[PDB]
Every structure is written in structure tokens, then in C-alpha cells.
Ligand binder design. Structure first.
Ligand SMILES: Nc1ncnc2c1ncn2[C@@H]1O[C@H](COP(=O)(O)OP(=O)(O)OP(=O)(O)O)[C@@H](O)[C@H]1O
Ligand SMILES: Nc1ncnc2c1ncn2[C@@H]1O[C@H](COP(=O)(O)OP(=O)(O)O)[C@@H](O)[C@H]1O
Ligand SMILES: [Mg+2]
Ligand SMILES: [Mg+2]
Lengths: 71, 552, 547
């Protein structure tokens, strides 16, 4: 498919000027062979583990936001 | 409110239009590579992709140069006009607003707005043209589903529209809190010898920290607002894509793939566009004060257009009463009625706080009387041209300010054309300042520090007297000037007041709460409680009441 | 430079917990983004191929929740990066201002107040505002560089030319731009500070400016300063755009160079299926390396542009070591011992040629002389504002510099020649610098200075707001509040530097009883001898010498 935006549009701009990210040949494939296999066999468990890590990170950061005010 | 911002940029639309045609041409060359090249098997792909890459690089280089050059003109124009509008305000405006508060608005608030405008405008145009190109491809895939996407699109505007008002009031409080801290800093730094003398260094630092704490409280809410905004735009964009996929799945039209492959790209452009609106609202709040200055109408009357070739120094007050706008219900002056004539010296005497310096302020047209009228040569002061009026009327303040430049520039300050050194030397000789200025290592080229801190206590009045004399003024005001002068300077002052042949071109108002020089005055006016209680010559006042209660 | 960057890390040390939290959320956000494209691609295959409602519904379900996790993770790392930017900014601002107050009085003759305020308000933002932008790009690019190199390692023989070609080119040519980009940033900051002084002078002394009708002259001066800043903005932006153009040409040159070498090893046996996919990985990782180097160089240039802020913060004042003496009782005997002085900012002009007078409690000492004789400079030495270049100044047979800073200025006070007040209440001007003072003490000082007469008539009495620098008071009224500010402290040594000049004839006769208590030491400074008739001891000063 034609990529009208950049291959990494979040990094396309710095301040008000452009950056050197473009689809000169195309967008790289970022799905390793092991991961795509894992995303269908035992795939449903990885989503729960991914969400739990986010929840644990949220709980830890909130505690640091509490400690760093008292410190 | 938004139209007030972009109204200034509309003065240079031609430059931006040239920028717009370059970016769209550069975009077309960049999208040409995926459309035309196969990167397989071959030379045909390599040469055209090399040429188009150079063309894209060159076109965007020229476009960025025009954009940066145009933004520089807008910034310098906006910052210049904000400062020009500040100086047009009334004298009360600079008592309501401190000098550190005003300078923060002119220097930092204006630069924040243009900096914000610079980054967002280029990003907005870039995503607008690609969004249109992505939309056009989607129209080819499916007319019906694009209309459904466009119909439900305005619903996504609702939530950023709510956050936008949060950004406005949040930014306004941040800007004014920084102004408060700036005033605290510059007020202490401008009076370090007093702060050091009273050991209040840590008292000033603590007073400064109380302002940073207010900023810290607002900065905490700004960080939460960013995360809320970043969550809503990304989540809402996902639902728009998923909702269409559900409709697409319910419609299985086997060619829906070509519409989906670019619909997933259109939502990424909308996601970026929805993030622009909160920062646009931030810029609106970041510039409330500077736009308030630019459209506020000053309290002063407009300057008139009268420039007589020759003017007499006939100044007459007629039932003048005045009250400062800070306390408009308390009258500082009551029913003043006296006349100044050329060739005569009038002495104004009174206790501290009697209103003498207020009389001088009215004569210099710094304030308007609340009653009666004040006339110069038969015409009201506002009827004269601004620069013309301040050449005929000159004054020496109770504590004259001295600007941080050379002595010759201080003496010749405010004159339309630079006088020759022969004129400056004559003025310095006439005021007695030549006795000490010539002794400086660099003479008239010596740079003086802020507020004239380098000069001695009594020498500052001598330099200020020279500044007033060089105008060849018609009315001369001496507010407490003669107290600290040397014996040599005092002889010069009483020579120019009572002896010099140039007296007949001047009318002099002499203000002093001491009897040092009022004996030779042609008329003496005693001011107490804002009203003139006694008047007459020196001998007449002696016979009026025994020992006068002010000299024995 | 590395020195200033290392100094900022020491200052940024307390904020590390926010940085590591941001890094964890950044990794979690990019960890999701390598999983979503699988499910979106699967949806495309199902929609275009053999449609199945259950597989289609399951695929879009996993796409939503992975996208939800990445969006949630990305939102909170932006938040903590922005917050830690403000913590750096406020700590920087507080520490800089606190350091300026510690400087000697010679520092404030060499600098302009409007430049210091502009430097405090502007240079601090330049040194902190890069954090939410540069750190996000630098870390994201660094992660993706490692990830992309992993794929290319399966084609290892071509990888060893990746690290040989583009790496030496950018590292060497970058130093030319870095050296000159930093220079223009320093010029911009100096120019905008120089323009700031124009607004400081025009607004601070407006009533003098308006007295001569020179408002339009000041506007022209400001616009000339703005033009000098506009030309510096253009040079900074034009040279960066030109530098950006060079790189992409250079990036394209390496691209053709590898494709040629990619096809050269083709004859030596690795198939076109590998080369076609490899070049996409080669393209992206080359772009990220260029971005990674550019952001790192930009980060150092911004820090180095604010070099003057660091120089102010670590500047050790030219003052003697702090004193420690603080006796519970003080007699108040002050004496000079062959004191000679020359101002630090302009030596080789001795203001005092040698003085040997002594002051005693209960006896009023008068100092008289013409303008420029050096009377106020003597008063400054009494208060330890400046150090004599010869001789010494003693209080109770101990050096004036050995006494504690807080203790000394509560026993020895003075009234200036031209007093300055601060924006606030009258009761704050009075009792200025006192940690605690009751209102009965303040009113006692006001009555002693004959200030209670006019304080009563104010709108809120003793709590009425005094205008900026005392602009909302008469000259005589300002003088009385300055006297009360000294009397409220119950001083042991009192210095009057021509304080009686601005007062009228009635008050100049009323305030003649300074020594009524008999314990204070009083020094009165006057211009003419007709003011010090009942002075117990009279000193005549001319040309820096006492006669
Ligand atoms: N900006 C102001 N706002 C309000 N009231 C003011 C302001 N400036 C001065 N006043 C008041 O106006 C009155 C007159 O003060 P003014 O400075 O004219 O006195 P003066 O006779 O010149 O005094 P002095 O002889 O001590 O110099 C005083 O009561 C003073 O407090
Ligand atoms: N901050 C300063 N820096 C350098 N020189 C100064 C400073 N203040 C005063 N001087 C010089 O030192 C001399 C001290 O005179 P001064 O004590 O002000 O006399 P008086 O107090 O009698 O007016 C003056 O001639 C002045 O030129
Ligand atoms: Mg006055
Ligand atoms: Mg003096």
C-alpha cells in the first residue's frame, strides 16, 4: 500500500522543521518471526501480561509522585 | 478570539501563499516514488527516484527559507507594536502596572505567542494537504463509507473543544504568575545597597519563592492536562477506525480493502489535527494581556496641532483643582489661581506634602485638572503639539532621573536633531556643570551608570539643569533643585534667575520648602493644605504676620 | 560543552525518578506498536480473502486492546516528561536568583538590571525547554536503531559495510555546524537581553521620558534593537536549513553507494529476495542514526548557549569570609585607623586619603564637606558595605567584618541620602528586614519620626499600600518613613547621611534630639556648617582628607 505519511510520522517533525524520515524504498517490517508465532499460539495470555505491566507501572509511578513530594 | 490572533498574520499573505504552493509541489514529488517505482529486477526506477529526491530536498529548502524569513518579520513587527502601544497609555497606567510586570508582557509574552505560532502553522499546513490527498484516495475506494466517515467526524471535535477552555484559563494564570515573580526580582536587584544594608537578602529570596510556588501548582495541572489530551485524541481516533471496520464487515463490495488501507492512514492525520486545537487555545490565553494593551484606549486627551512661531511665557491657573485617580474623592489641590509672566520669578513655598510637586506635574501636562482650566499663552495645554509643548516647557524634578548613556546624550536628550558641542558646552557652563564635567577622565563622553548612580548627590541637579536649559525653554520649573548645589553653581543659578539678560524670554516657577532663595522672587505664594493661603512680595509677607512663623 | 552538561546532571539529579519512569513508559509504548500491525494486517487478509465473522471479530478485538495499552502508556510518558521540565526550570530560576543576592556591590555596577532580569527570565527557558522534545526523539530513535540492526544481522556480511560508510562521514562534518550553531545562539541571547534594557529604561523612568516628549525616540531605539535580533534569527535559521539540505544529499549518496556494492557481491554467488528487503532496513536505520546524532548535538548547543547563567550561579563574591561575633551587649564605640579606600570598579582614584576619627556613645559627631568629598563613602564603610584598601574599621575594638551579618545590621543602621522604598504596606516598609515586629513597636517608631501625622490620613492608615519605589508619596513623606525604618530597630549606632535635607523648616528643628537617650552613637552628615551647631564633635572633609 502507498504510504502517504512517513514511515515514522511521530518523528517526522522537530519544532517547525522536517526530519529525515521518509519512505525512500518503503516501510520496514517490524514483526519478528518468533513474535508472530507467539501472537497466535498462547497469544491471548500475552495481552494480559502486557496490560498487567502497564498497571504495575501506573501504580509504581503514582507512589513515586507521592514520595518525591514529601522528600 | 482566534480571529484576533491570525489578523496580524494577514498583512503578509503573499509570502505564505508562495510557501503553500512549494510544500504541495514538494509533497507531490515525495509521493511519486511509491506510485511509480518498483525497486525490482531497474535503471528506470533508480534515475527518476534519484532526481525526484533531489527535487524534493531543494523544494523544501526554499520553502523553509521563505517561512522562516516571514516569521521573523511577524515577530519583530508584533513585538515593536506592543511596546509602542504601551507608551501611549496614561500616566496612571504605569502605577496600576509595575515596571517588572509590563516588561515581562512585552518581552516574554509576545515572544511566546510568535514561537507558538511558528511551530504549529507549518505543521498544520503539512498535515492538511496530505489529509486531503488521503481523503481523495478514499473517495475512489468508496463514496458511501467516506460520507459516513465525514458525517461522524464532527462528533470527535466535542471533547477537545471542552479541554480547550481549560487550557485558556490555565495559561493566563501561569503568565501572570511569571510577571509577579519578575517584578519581585527586578525590584530587589535595582535596590541592592538598601537590601544589603538591612540584611534582607533571605527575606527577598523567600518573597521570590512564594511566587514560584504558585507557578509550581499550575505546572502540575498542565502535566495532567497533557496526558488527558494525549489519551483522548488517540483513543477517539481508534474508535473512529474500528467503527468503520465494523460497518465494513457488516457490508460483506469485495474491494473494501483499498478503502480500509487508506482509512487507517486518514485517522492518523485527524489525530494530529485534533492535538493542534488545545495548543491554539493555549496561545489565545498566552496573549490576553498583550492584545489588551494593543486595543485599550488611553485616558489622555489627544495631542492638538498648534505650533506658534513665537510664544510668550504667560501661564495662568484659573480655579484649578485636582485629585489623583488613586484617591479621586480626596482633592490634593483646591482653587489655585495665579499667573506667571515673562521676566518674573515666582516662588512657591509650603510644608511637606502640601501639593507643590503636584502643581509642577499639572504644568508639564502629566495629568489633567478635575476643575478649572490651565492655559499657556491663552490656549489649553492639550491644544499644542506634543513635541512642541515639551520644548517650550522644561522642568527639573525633585529627584531627576539620569539614563545610562554618555553625558552629552543626557544633556541633549529628546531633542529632534543633535546639537553641536558648542551648544552643549554653553548649556553646561550656564548651569555650572562645566566646572566638574571637564574634570572627568573622559569628559562629556563618560558613560554614567543606571539612574545616575555614578554622580555625586549635588552634581545630579546640575546636569539636570543643563538638560532643561538647552531647550531654550519659555517656562522653566525648578522643583527643589537649588538645595544641594555648590557655591559656584548657586551663584550661576541666582545669576540666571535674577541677573542674566536672557530673563525676559522666560517665566520661572521656583518651588522650595526652604527660604534659601525666595527673598529675591518677584512674587511669593504660600501653599498649605492644597490651597494658597498667603501671597505677595517678601516685604509684604513680613508685615502680614509677626516673624511669619517660618523663619524664627 | 561536557562541563556545563555535567553540571546540569548534578542539578537534574533529584528528578531522576521522573526520567526512569518516562523511559519505562516509552519502552512499553513502543513494545505495543510492534504488535498492532500484525492484527491490522490480519484484518486486511480476512476482509479481502476468505471472510469469517468470528475471526474478523477476534482480530479487531485484539487490535483495540493493544492500541489501548500503547495509547495509555504514551499519554503518561508525555505527562511526566513535561512535568520534569518544569521542575528543572523552577529549580534553575530559584538557585540563580539566590546566588545574585550573595554577590558584592561591585557586581551591580558592571551589569544592568534589565539585562539580569531578561537573562533570568529567558535564558532559563532555553536551558530546560528541550527536555520534552529532544529526550523523546533521542530515546525512541535509540531503541529503533537497535531493533532494526537485529534484522540486518541475519544478512551479516552486508552489515559490516553499514558501520563503515555513513558513520565516519557524519561524525566529522558535524563539528563544523556544532561550533557555529552554538555561537549564533549566544549572540541571540545577548541581543535580546540588550533589547530588554531599552524597555527597562523607558518604562522605569517614563515620567522623565514623557516630560521631554521622547516616547517616539525610545520606540525607534527599541525597533533598532529588534532589527538586530531579526538578522540573528535569520542567520540561525538559514544555516540550519542549508545544513539539513546537505545531509539528505549525503544520505542519498550512501544509498546509491550501497546499492552498487549490494549488486557487486551479487555476482559472487544473498538472493534478490534478501537484498530487496535488506535495503529497506538499511534505509531506515541510516535515517535514525542521522536523527540520533542531530538531536545529541542540538542538546549540547542549547546548554552551551546559556553559559552566562552558569557563570553567575557559581560566581564567588569578592567579600571577606563571614563573621561570627554576636555579643549580648554592645557599647557602640567606633573608630577609624588610617583608613584609605578606592572603589573596586575604578581603582587608581583614591577617594579617602586617610582618616583617624573616633566616635563615642552619647556624643553627636558631625561630618561636613562639599559634594564629592567622600562623606557617603565613609558611611558605607561604617556599614561594612565596602572594604577599605588600607587601615581598618573597628567596632568595640573588633573589626567590623568579624561581626555576624544579621547581627551587625541590627545594631548599626543608617538613613540614605535619597531613600528608596519597596512596593507594599507602610507597616512593611517600616520594620523592613525584621522577622517579627509588633504593631505597637511600629507605631512608636512612626511617632518618633513624626510620621504618624500623615500615616493617619492615608486610605488604610498604617496598612496603606506604598507605590513602586515610593512613587505614591511626597518627597518629605518618603524621608520620614526612612527615618522610622531605622528607629524601629533600636540601633546602637545611627548614621544620618543628609536625611534632614528634604524635611521642611519645622521638622528640621524638631528632630535635633538624637542623643536624648545617651547610649546611642550618632553621626550626622551635612553639606553646610549651619546645620550642626550643637554637634559635640565636628569633622571637616575635603578631597578625601580631614582637616
Ligand atoms: N501617585 C499618587 N497617588 C495618590 N496620592 C499621591 C500621589 N503622589 C502624591 N500623592 C499625595 O499628594 C499629596 C501632595 O504630594 P506632593 O508630592 O505634591 O507634595 P509636595 O508639596 O511636593 O511635598 P514635598 O515638599 O515633601 O516634596 C500628598 O498627600 C501625597 O501623599
Ligand atoms: N558606585 C561607585 N563606583 C565608583 N565610584 C563612585 C561610586 N560612588 C561614588 N563614586 C565616586 O567616589 C566619590 C565619592 O563621593 P561621595 O561620597 O558621593 O560624596 P558626597 O557623599 O559628599 O556626595 C565621588 O566623587 C564619586 O565620583
Ligand atoms: Mg515634592
Ligand atoms: Mg553624598
Amino acid at each position: 500500500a502507498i504510504r502517504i505519511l512517513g514511515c515514522d510520522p511521530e518523528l517526522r517533525f522537530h519544532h517547525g522543521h522536517a526530519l529525515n524520515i521518509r519512505g525512500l524504498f518503503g516501510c520496514p517490517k517490524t514483526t519478528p518471526k518468533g513474535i508472530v508465532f507467539l501472537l497466535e499460539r498462547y497469544g491471548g495470555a500475552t495481552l494480559m501480561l502486557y496490560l498487567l505491566m502497564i498497571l504495575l507501572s501506573l501504580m509504581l509511578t503514582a507512589l513515586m509522585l507521592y514520595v518525591i513530594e514529601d522528600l | 478570539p482566534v480571529r484576533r490572533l491570525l489578523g496580524c498574520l494577514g498583512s503578509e499573505t503573499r509570502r505564505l501563499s508562495l510557501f503553500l504552493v512549494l510544500v504541495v509541489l514538494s509533497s507531490l514529488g515525495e509521493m511519486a516514488i511509491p506510485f511509480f517505482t518498483g525497486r525490482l529486477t531497474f535503471t528506470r526506477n533508480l534515475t527518476l527516484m534519484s532526481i525526484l529526491t533531489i527535487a524534493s530536498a531543494v523544494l523544501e529548502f526554499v520553502g523553509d527559507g521563505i517561512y522562516n524569513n516571514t516569521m521573523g518579520h511577524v515577530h519583530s513587527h508584533l513585538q515593536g507594536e506592543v511596546f509602542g502601544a504601551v507608551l501611549r497609555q496614561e500616566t496612571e497606567f504605569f502605577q496600576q502596572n509595575q515596571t517588572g510586570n509590563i516588561m515581562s508582557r512585552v518581552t516574554e509574552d509576545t515572544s511566546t505567542l510568535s514561537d507558538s505560532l511558528s511551530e504549529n502553522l507549518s505543521l498544520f499546513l503539512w498535515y492538511l494537504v496530505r489529509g486531503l490527498c488521503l481523503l481523495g484516495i478514499m473517495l475512489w475506494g468508496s463514496v458511501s463509507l467516506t460520507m459516513v466517515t465525514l458525517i461522524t467526524l464532527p462528533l470527535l471535535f466535542l471533547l477537545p473543544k471542552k479541554v480547550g477552555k481549560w487550557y485558556q484559563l490555565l495559561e493566563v494564570q501561569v503568565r501572570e504568575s511569571l510577571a509577579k515573580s519578575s517584578q519581585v526580582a527586578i525590584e530587589a536587584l535595582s535596590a541592592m545597597p538598601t537590601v544589603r544594608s538591612f540584611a534582607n537578602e533571605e527575606g527577598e529570596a523567600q518573597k521570590f519563592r512564594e511566587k514560584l510556588q504558585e507557578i509550581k501548582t499550575l505546572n502540575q495541572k498542565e502535566a495532567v492536562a497533557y496526558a488527558v489530551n494525549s489519551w483522548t485524541t488517540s483513543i477517539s481516533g481508534m474508535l473512529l477506525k474500528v467503527g468503520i471496520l465494523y460497518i465494513g464487515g457488516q457490508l460483506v463490495s469485495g474491494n473494501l480493502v483499498t478503502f480500509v488501507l487508506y482509512q487507517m492512514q486518514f485517522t492518523q492525520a485527524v489525530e494530529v489535527l485534533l492535538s493542534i486545537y488545545p495548543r491554539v487555545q493555549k496561545a489565545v490565553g498566552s496573549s490576553e494581556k498583550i492584545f489588551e494593551y494593543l486595543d485599550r484606549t488611553p485616558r489622555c486627551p489627544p495631542s492638538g496641532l498648534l505650533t506658534p512661531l513665537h510664544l510668550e511665557g504667560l501661564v495662568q491657573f484659573q480655579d484649578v483643582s485636582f485629585a489623583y485617580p488613586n484617591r479621586p474623592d480626596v482633592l490634593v489641590l483646591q482653587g489655585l489661581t495665579f499667573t506667571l509672566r515673562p521676566g518674573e520669578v515666582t516662588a512657591l513655598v509650603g510644608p511637606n506634602g502640601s501639593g507643590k510637586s503636584t502643581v509642577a506635574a499639572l504644568l508639564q501636562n502629566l495629568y489633567q485638572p478635575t476643575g478649572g482650566q490651565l492655559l499657556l499663552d491663552g490656549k489649553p495645554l492639550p491644544q499644542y503639539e506634543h513635541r512642541y509643548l515639551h520644548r517650550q516647557v522644561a522642568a527639573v524634578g525633585q529627584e531627576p532621573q539620569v539614563f545610562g548613556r554618555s553625558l552629552q546624550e543626557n544633556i541633549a536628550y529628546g531633542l529632534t536633531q543633535k546639537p553641536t558641542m558648542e551648544e552643549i558646552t554653553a548649556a553646561a557652563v550656564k548651569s555650572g556643570a562645566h566646572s566638574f564635567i571637564s574634570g572627568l577622565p573622559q569628559g562629556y563622553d563618560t558613560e554614567v551608570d543606571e539612574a545616575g548612580s555614578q554622580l555625586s548627590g549635588g552634581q545630579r541637579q546640575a546636569v539636570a539643569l543643563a538638560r532643561a536649559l538647552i531647550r531654550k525653554p519659555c517656562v522653566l520649573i525648578l522643583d527643589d533643585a537649588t538645595s544641594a548645589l555648590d557655591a559656584n553653581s548657586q551663584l550661576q543659578v541666582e545669576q540666571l534667575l535674577y541677573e542674566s539678560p536672557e530673563r525676559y524670554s522666560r517665566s520661572v516657577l521656583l518651588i522650595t520648602q526652604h527660604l534659601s532663595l525666595v527673598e529675591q522672587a518677584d512674587h511669593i505664594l504660600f501653599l498649605e493644605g492644597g490651597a494658597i493661603r498667603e501671597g505677595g512680595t517678601h516685604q509684604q509677607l513680613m508685615e502680614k504676620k509677626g516673624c511669619y512663623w517660618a523663619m524664627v | 560543552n561536557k562541563v556545563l552538561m555535567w553540571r546540569l546532571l548534578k542539578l537534574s539529579r533529584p528528578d531522576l525518578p521522573l526520567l526512569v519512569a518516562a523511559f519505562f513508559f516509552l519502552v512499553l509504548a513502543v513494545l505495543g506498536e510492534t504488535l498492532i500491525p500484525h492484527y491490522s494486517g490480519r484484518v486486511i487478509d480476512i476482509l479481502g480473502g476468505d471472510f469469517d465473522p468470528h475471526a474478523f471479530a477476534s482480530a479487531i478485538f485484539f487490535m483495540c486492546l493493544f492500541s489501548f495499552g500503547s495509547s495509555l502508556s504514551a499519554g503518561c510518558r508525555g505527562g511526566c516528561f513535561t512535568y520534569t521540565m518544569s521542575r528543572i526550570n523552577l529549580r534553575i530560576r530559584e538557585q540563580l536568583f539566590s546566588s545574585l543576592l550573595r554577590q558584592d556591590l561591585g557586581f551591580f555596577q558592571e551589569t544592568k538590571t534589565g539585562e539580569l532580569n531578561s537573562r533570568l527570565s529567558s535564558d532559563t527557558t532555553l536551558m530546560s525547554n528541550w527536555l520534552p522534545l529532544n529526550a523523546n526523539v533521542l530515546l525512541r530513535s535509540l531503541v529503533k536503531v537497535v531493533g532494526l540492526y537485529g534484522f540486518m544481522l541475519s544478512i551479516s556480511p552486508r552489515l559490516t559495510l553499514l558501520s563503515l560508510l555513513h558513520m565516519p562521514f557524519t561524525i566529522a562534518a558535524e563539528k563544523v555546524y556544532n561550533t557555529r550553531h552554538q555561537e549564533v545562539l549566544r549572540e541571540i541571547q545577548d541581543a535580546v537581553a540588550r533589547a530588554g534594557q531599552v524597555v527597562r529604561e523607558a518604562v522605569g523612568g517614563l515620567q522623565t521620558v514623557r516630560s521631554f516628549g521622547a516616547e517616539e525616540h525610545e520606540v525607534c531605539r527599541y525597533k533598532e534593537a529588534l532589527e538586530q535580533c531579526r538578522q540573528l534569527y535569520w542567520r540561525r535559521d538559514l544555516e540550519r536549513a542549508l545544513y539539513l539540505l546537505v545531509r539528505r544529499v549525503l544520505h542519498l549518496g550512501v544509498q546509491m553507494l550501497m546499492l552498487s556494492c549490494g549488486l557487486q557481491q551479487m555476482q559472487d554467488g544473498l538472493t534478490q529476495g534478501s537484498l530487496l528487503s535488506f535495503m529497506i532496513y538499511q534505509e531506515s536505520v541510516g535515517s535514525y542514526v542521522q536523527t540520533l546524532v542531530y538531536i545529541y548535538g542540538d542538546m549540547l548547543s542549547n546548554v552551551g548557549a546559556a553559559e552566562k547563567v552558569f557563570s553567575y550561579m557559581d560566581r564567588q563574591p569578592n567579600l571577606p569570609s563571614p563573621g561570627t561575633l554576636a555579643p549580648t551587649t554592645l557599647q557602640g564605640v567606633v573608630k577609624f585607623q588610617d583608613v584609605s579606600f578606592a572603589y573596586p570598579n575604578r581603582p587608581d582614584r583614591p577617594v579617602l586619603k586617610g582618616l583617624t576619627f573616633t566616635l563615642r556613645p552619647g556624643e553627636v559627631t558631625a561630618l561636613v564637606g562639599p559634594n564629592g568629598s567622600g562623606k557617603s563613602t565613609v558611611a558605607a564603610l561604617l556599614q561594612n558595605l565596602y572594604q577599605p584598601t588600607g587601615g581598618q574599621v573597628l567596632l568595640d575594638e573588633k573589626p567590623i567584618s568579624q561581626y555576624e551579618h544579621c547581627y551587625l545590621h541590627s545594631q548599626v543602621v543608617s538613613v540614605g541620602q535619597e531613600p528608596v522604598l519597596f512596593s507594599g504596606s507602610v507597616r512593611n516598609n517600616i520594620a523592613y528586614g525584621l522577622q517579627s515586629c509588633e504593631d505597637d513597636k511600629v507605631m512608636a517608631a512612626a511617632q518618633a519620626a513624626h510620621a504618624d501625622d500623615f500615616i493617619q490620613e492615608m486610605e488604610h492608615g498604617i496598612y496603606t499600600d506604598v507605590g513602586e519605589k515610593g512613587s505614591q508619596l511626597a518627597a518629605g513623606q518618603k524621608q520620614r518613613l526612612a527615618i522610622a525604618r531605622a528607629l524601629v530597630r533600636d540601633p546602637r549606632v545611627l548614621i544620618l547621611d543628609e536625611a534632614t535635607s528634604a524635611l521642611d523648616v519645622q521638622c528640621e528643628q524638631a528632630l535635633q534630639d538624637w542623643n536624648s537617650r545617651g547610649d546611642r552613637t550618632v553621626l550626622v552628615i551635612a553639606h553646610r556648617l549651619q546645620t550642626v551647631q550643637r554637634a559635640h564633635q565636628i569633622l571637616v572633609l575635603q578631597e578625601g582628607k580631614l582637616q
